[PDB]
Amino acid sequence: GEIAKALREIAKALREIAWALREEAKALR
Amino acid sequence: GEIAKALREIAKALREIAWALREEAKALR
Amino acid sequence: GEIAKALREIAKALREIAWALREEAKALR
Amino acid sequence: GEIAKALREIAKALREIAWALREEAKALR
Amino acid sequence: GEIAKALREIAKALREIAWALREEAKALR
């Protein structure tokens, strides 16, 4: 339901943050 | 309904943190 | 209710982290 | 109640993270 | 059930963020 959907949307935004950090780690090397 | 809406608000804030990190990354020429 | 209001306070605190990260990016460039 | 209080405590810890990031942004300056 | 599964997806995305932060450190050093 709606609460579980919103928690999955939180997990996706956290994966979005991880993609940006993996990009920064590439650029730093 | 208010609980699910506040969780979606948390996901939106986390997407805003991802956007700020993309700009930090780009932010080193 | 009280749980919804506390979740809204968590979203506000995450928006305060996004502002700070944007300021970090502006300080390097 | 105890769940709502713990959620408010998570929001307080996130504000401590924002405060430390704001300080780093002034340090980079 | 579905709420518990979504919380586990959140923990895994946080583990991805930790791996990316470790890699930023290693790129520097």
Next chain:
Amino acid sequence: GEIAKALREIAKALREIAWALREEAKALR
């Protein structure tokens, strides 16, 4: 209960992240 106890543990892990970031700001300065 067990849920409130786990939420308090999440708040302490976030205070632990803020300690590490305050030390990084103290060093930069």
Next chain:
Amino acid sequence: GEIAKALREIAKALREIAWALREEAKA
């Protein structure tokens, strides 16, 4: 029990993030 277990798993991943930040500051 499964929701509380998943919340403790989140706290453990946050402690792993605090450890990675300490290692970033050493560099």
